[PDB]
Each structure stands twice: as structure tokens, then as C-alpha cells.
Amino acid sequence: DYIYQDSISLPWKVLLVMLLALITLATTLSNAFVIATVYRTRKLHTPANYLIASLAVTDLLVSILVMPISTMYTVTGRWTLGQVVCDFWLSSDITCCTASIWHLCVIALDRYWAITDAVEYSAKRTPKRAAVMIALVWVFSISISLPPFFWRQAKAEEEVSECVVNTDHILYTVYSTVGAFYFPTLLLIALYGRIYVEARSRIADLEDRWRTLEDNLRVIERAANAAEVREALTRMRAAAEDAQRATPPSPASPEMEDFRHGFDILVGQIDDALRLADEGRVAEAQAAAEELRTTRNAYIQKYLMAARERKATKTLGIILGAFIVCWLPFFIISLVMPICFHLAIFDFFTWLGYLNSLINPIIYTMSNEDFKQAFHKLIRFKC
Amino acid sequence: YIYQDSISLPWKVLLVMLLALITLATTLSNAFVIATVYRTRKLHTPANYLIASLAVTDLLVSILVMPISTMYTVTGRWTLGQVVCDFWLSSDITCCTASIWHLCVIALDRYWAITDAVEYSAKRTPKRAAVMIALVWVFSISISLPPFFWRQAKSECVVNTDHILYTVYSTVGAFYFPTLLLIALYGRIYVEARSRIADLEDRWRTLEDNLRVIERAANAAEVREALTRMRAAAEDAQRATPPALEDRSPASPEMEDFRHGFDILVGQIDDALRLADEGRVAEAQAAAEELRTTRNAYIQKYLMAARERKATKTLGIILGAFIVCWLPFFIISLVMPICFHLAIFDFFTWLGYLNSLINPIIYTMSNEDFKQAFHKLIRFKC
Ligand SMILES: CSc1ccc2c(c1)[C@@H](N1CCN(C)CC1)Cc1ccccc1S2
Ligand SMILES: CSc1ccc2c(c1)[C@@H](N1CCN(C)CC1)Cc1ccccc1S2
């Protein structure tokens, strides 16, 4: 029994409490940054952003209930706080960190329902629905941490020298590891590959509907009779109609209302250029095609931003990517620990795992343009 | 565009040849085991009954799954229709699931055989082994049952991706959960074995040093002090039961020989203590020379514990191979939806099936009962 913390000198001990309390703080500020931004901004009050808020709540509770106590226990190498504190430290640590994974999946589940059931769930999605999901996330995270302590009743010790999870029951060693990490993690990897292709699909959908509207504008311009024109317009009508069915979705930006109003305008123009041929004016419908092209240049160069909506999916992929690299090495290494300086690196991937609670809100700021401007506004880098 | 069409007929033939070889080798290997168990009277145990039902499982892969797979892989098309695609996946999922869970039920028996060695030796019957077999199959079934329960409501054969819920639940409950169970049950028993060898490897160091002492000892106080600690070492060696024999029957003939061997050696310590009371010391040093000869014969024979830890390691090679077989399938399966690629996905499916071959061949290579059973069959020995 040799604690390696003793070999590490006082200069580095200080640097490490400094560094870890920095991380602890950086996490306390970043997640507080998000929760305030959501609550204060009326624009952002959505069942979508509540999940994002309750995620930062969770990651904030790591920087509060877990991370500073870890800061002590990691640097020192001994647990001075006793048994009942060792209890709630692990309980909160598993529960918070569990809830942060399950808030991610409840987020991606809402994003799954926002697309596939876009028609259905837009009515179903209330704050109550977002709230009940949040409640079950915490409640599950609790009942993951609840089993170790029900069993602890047989032995009682006056003094405590160390605080790590119970390895007595293998049953709840696996159950926790999987139920808390593996299961909802693999869930998110599945919900990403799901929605990544969904985005890839609906963009090919509308890009093909654009090639319809693009080529048929060339047809109307080049068509020498009234029949080839209406033929183009009828294929443009059914294309704009089909394109309308598929919509990108969370705060729906003013620009996006403008591309949907850009379609109702465009369909308004297809209805007029048909009335123009009914009036018998063909070379006018070829001037109405010069018109549609200007509406195209107005709204569709702006629609070259549905291409951004697909990239807004990739950012959740980067969360998933970061999330994994953070926690997985812990869960890789934790199972090999009994067989396998080594205890130093186990302590490391716990912090690397806690580092997710920092990394989750900073991504939203970098990725999401709502928060980035909220961010630029606070420090005043952008007027 | 299906790439099976680009692959030429000569290689098509080599691949049905290779896969049907694997299909056969698996049909042969697992039948080899099941026959050996039933036929050998020595081997009839609830322990090997589990080992048999594992080979049963792996045999059903070489039957229900592998020859049908052999076709669908080489051609690239499923000609057999809907109701066949149903039972092919059902059997494939159920068998391959049962093979992971027969492994864990094996390691669960090995866990209860060691840690609860006192308790479970009475609890372990064939009935106890059998009910476990049943729940293994039953679980494996109810993993394959949901796709079909749900399709009732509403050219190629692959698993249902409609419910992401049961895409995951199946992937985890059938593979990830019990695999991680086995990795945990191995790290459990690997250290458990390391512990019981270290206990008695330390007891060896006690009785060795105290023999140096008594050989270098000049007094009755120093000798009797040595003898008391040698007695209590044998008594404290008796609280700890040995791992090779805990997996055996607790009352085995080999076990009584090491416990009676302790009673002999302690009986020898009782005379050399009584010898010091009479005032005879250098006679106890003729008695100490006597102790060394007896101890070496008994300890070199019990030095088969170097073997018990290694008999655990053979499950470690199974766990190791098993994972290397199936994991790449489960690595790739999650990356497939996003990410020529379908060629290698088909490959780790066969590499996964290759486990059904690799499981019984290990028992032969590892277990010395089968190795001799094998040499006898083919007439390897003159
Ligand atoms: C096999 S040991 C094990 C099993 C389950 C869980 C953990 C560790 C948990 N640790 C983290 C480190 N902390 C010092 C103790 C609790 C890791 C985690 C992370 C995120 C969500 C849920 C969980 S549950
Ligand atoms: C995400 S796709 C998926 C999900 C669950 C399972 C499989 C595949 C299973 N495959 C293998 C290939 N075979 C053609 C069909 C069944 C693989 C396997 C292997 C061992 C034990 C249980 C299982 S259950």
C-alpha cells in the first residue's frame, strides 16, 4: 500500500489544486452561463432549450457537488471527510454524471421526434413533456446510485481512509456501468447515425427539388409553345409543393420563416405565370421566368443555408465524439483495473470524464449562433 | 450495385469451399465435445453439462446458421423468402446469444465454485446447471422475439433497424452486457486465484525460513518459538482452502491427501515440541531434517496450483478470442449507418461465427481429457 501522492512534490501539488479548482470553476461559470442565457432570453424559452438548460444544471452540479471535493481527494490521496460524505459524494457523482448522459439522449430523442414525427410531435411537445423527460433522467440516475447503499447495512466502520465505488456485487458493477454509460451512449451513437442520414436525405430531397425548379426555369425560357411552359410550371408546382413538405427544424430563425414564406411567394409566382399563359401571353411568362430567377436569387442563395442545418447535426456528433473520449477511457480502464502509477491514470480519466461537464457547454457556444452572440455580447467583443 | 457480381466464379467457389469447411469444422468440433462428455463417465458433472450445452449451441450455428450464411455471403442475394429470413435471424441471434450466456453461466459456476466454494458445492446439482441452461436459451429467444412481435402490427436478409430502441437493447442485452459480465467475472477469479496461490506461496516461505532457523537454532526457546509459528501456519493454511480442489469436489481424494498431509506435518511439530519439554533439542533437529523430506514430497505434488491459475487463464483465452471474434462486428455495426464497406461487415460476421469453431478447439487444446480423447479417435498413438 503505497500512495503515489506522497512522491509528488509541494510545487506540483499546488499547481494541481490551482489547475483543478480552475477546471472546477471554468465548469461552474460555463454551465451557469448557459442556464442564465436561456432563462433571461424570452426568445429562447422552448422545450428544446429547457433540456439544454437542465443539461447545464447537471454539469453545474458536477462542478459543485463532485468536482471540488475530487480536487481535494485527487491531489492529497486521502479521504478526510468520512463515510456519510463518501456516500453522497459517489451518489451525486454517479447520479449527476449519469443524468448528463441521459440529458444528451433525451435531447437527441427530441431531435429525433422533431424530424421523423415533425408533424406529430410539434403538437405533443410541451414544456410538460420536456419536464417529465428531465424528471425521469434524474430519477433514473438516482436509482443507479441507490443500489450500493441498500446493501451497506451489514458492515459499519467508524473511520474511513478511501472513497471508491463498491466492487462487492459484480451484478451491480456491470448493471451500473452499462445502464449508466454503455446503454445510453450506444443509444446516442445510434440516434446520431439515424439523424445524420435523415439530414443527408432531406438535403438531397430539396437539392433535387431545386434542380427541378432550376431546369424548368430554363425550359420556360427556351420553350416555344404554351404547352411546354405549363409542363414546366406543373413540374415546378409539384416540386415546390413537395419541397414545402420537408422543412428543417429548437428556435426557428427569422431567416427560416423567410424561406418558407419564400416558398409561398414562389408558389404564388408559379400560380401567376400559369394565369399568364391562360391570358395567352407566353413571351411574358418567359419574362415571369426572369422574375422567378430574381426570387430565386433572393431566397435560394439564402436557402444555400439548409446546407448549414446539416452541419448543425455534426455538432451533436462532436458532442458525442468528445463525450466518448472523455468518459469511455474511464470505462475501458475501470474493468481492466482489478487485473492491472496505474492508480494515477485511473484518477486521470475520472477528471477527463468530468472534463465533459466543461466541454458540453463550450461546444454549444462555439456551435450554436444564439449562444455565440450572447457570448460576444457579455464580454463585448462584437457590438 | 452488389459487389458479389464483380467477384469472379473461381473465387466464389473457393469461398463456398472455405465457409463450408468452417461450417463443417464447427459441426465436427462441437460434436466431438458433446460426444466425449456423454461417453466419458469421468466427465459427467454439472460443470461439463454446461460445457456440453455450449457446444450444442455452437453446433446449432454450424447447422441452422452457417450453411445458410455460406450461400447468402458468396452470392450476395437471399433467394429463400420471408419466412426463412425470419427463422434464420431468429436462430442466429438466439444461438449466438446463448453461446455468450452459456459462457457467463460457466464463469458464474466458476465464481460460485471458488468464492462460495463451501456453500455452492451442495447447491450445485445437475438440476441447478440445467435450469441455468434453460434460462440461457429462453433469454436468447426473447431477444429474437421482439422484431416479429412488432412486424405483426404493421431479396435481402438483415436485422430490423426500425426500432432504435431494440437495435440497442438487443446489441447490449445480448452482447455488451454479458460480455462485460464475463470480463468482470474473469478479473474477479483471476485475482481470486492469484490470492489463494499467494496465501500458500507465503506459507511455503514461512516453513522454509523456520527450517533454516531450526537448522541454525542453538536453543529450546528459539526452537519452540519456531515450532509454534509453523503449527499456526498449518492451522491458518487450513482456514484457506486450495483453488484447484475447490473446483474439484471438496471431499476429493487429492484434497484429503493435502489435509491429512497437514495433520501429519502438525503431528510432527507436536512431537518436537514435546521433545523440548523432555529436554532433548538436537533430537528435534534430527526431527527437523525429517520434516524437510516429508514436506518436499507433499509440496511438490501440491505444487499444481501453478496449474489452477493457468486453468483460469484458458477462460481468459476464450474471453480473449470470443471478443476478438464478435467485437469487430459490434464495433463496425454502430459505425456502418454513417460510413466496399459491406464486404468487411460480412467478414466480421463470419469472424464472429468463427468463434463457434474456436470455442471447442480451445477445450481440446486446453483440457487434457479431450486431447487424449482426440489422439485416441484418429489413432495418433502407437
Ligand atoms: C465500473 S466503476 C463505475 C461504474 C459506474 C459509474 C461510474 C464508475 C462513474 N464514476 C465516475 C468517477 N467517480 C469517481 C465515481 C463514479 C462514471 C460515470 C460517468 C458518467 C455517467 C455515469 C457514470 S456511473
Ligand atoms: C446491431 S446488428 C445486431 C444486433 C444484435 C445482434 C446481432 C446483430 C447478431 N447478428 C449477427 C449476424 N447475423 C447475421 C444476425 C445476428 C450478432 C450477435 C452475436 C452474438 C450474440 C448475439 C448477437 S445479437
UniProtKB/Swiss-Prot annotation, chain A:
Effect after changing residue 337 to A: No effect on agonist binding
One CC-aspect GO term: plasma membrane
GO molecular function: G protein-coupled serotonin receptor activity; Gi/o-coupled serotonin receptor activity; neurotransmitter receptor activity; serotonin binding; serotonin receptor activity
Organism: Homo sapiens
Consequence when changing residue 176 to A: No effect on agonist binding
Chief location category: membrane
Effect noted on mutating residue 334 to A: No effect on agonist binding
Effect of residue 334 to E: Reduced G(i)/(o)-coupled receptor activity
Lipid-attached positions, S-palmitoyl cysteine: 383
Keywords per UniProt: Behavior, Cell membrane, Disulfide bond, G-protein coupled receptor, Glycoprotein, Lipoprotein, Membrane, Palmitate, Phosphoprotein, Receptor, Transducer, Transmembrane, Transmembrane helix
Protein known as: 5-hydroxytryptamine receptor 1B
UniProtKB/Swiss-Prot annotation, chain B:
Keywords: Behavior, Cell membrane, Disulfide bond, G-protein coupled receptor, Glycoprotein, Lipoprotein, Membrane, Palmitate, Phosphoprotein, Receptor, Transducer, Transmembrane, Transmembrane helix
Segments carrying motif NPxxY motif: 359-363
Gene Ontology biological process: adenylate cyclase-inhibiting G protein-coupled receptor signaling pathway; adenylate cyclase-inhibiting serotonin receptor signaling pathway; bone remodeling; cellular response to alkaloid; cellular response to xenobiotic stimulus; chemical synaptic transmission; G protein-coupled receptor signaling pathway, coupled to cyclic nucleotide second messenger; negative regulation of serotonin secretion
Motif DRY motif boundaries: 109-111
Bilayer-spanning residue ranges: 10-35, 50-74, 83-108, 129-147, 164-187, 315-336, 342-364
Binding partners and assembly: Homodimer. Heterodimer with HTR1D.
Membrane topology designation: Multi-pass membrane protein
Cystine residue pairs: 85-157
Expression sites (tissue/organ): Detected in cerebral artery smooth muscle cells (at protein level). Detected in brain cortex, striatum, amygdala, medulla, hippocampus, caudate nucleus and putamen.
Cytoplasmic side: 36-49, 109-128, 365-382
Annotated ergotamine binding sites: 92, 97, 159
Impact reported for residue 96 to A: Abolishes agonist binding
Name under which the protein is recorded: 5-hydroxytryptamine receptor 1B
Membership in a protein family: Belongs to the G-protein coupled receptor 1 family.
Domain observations: Ligands are bound in a hydrophobic pocket formed by the transmembrane helices.
The keyword Glycoprotein belongs to this UniProt entry's keyword annotation: yes
GO MF term (any one): G protein-coupled serotonin receptor activity
Top-level division of the source organism's lineage: Eukaryota
Organism encoding this protein: Homo sapiens (Human)
Extracellular side stretches: 75-82, 148-163
Effect of residue 326 to A: Abolishes agonist binding
PANTHER family cross-referenced by the UniProt entry: 5-HYDROXYTRYPTAMINE RECEPTOR 1B (PTHR24248:SF201), ADRENERGIC RECEPTOR-RELATED G-PROTEIN COUPLED RECEPTOR (PTHR24248)
Post-translational modification: Phosphorylated. Desensitization of the receptor may be mediated by its phosphorylation. Palmitoylated.
Source taxonomy: Eukaryota, Metazoa, Chordata, Craniata, Vertebrata
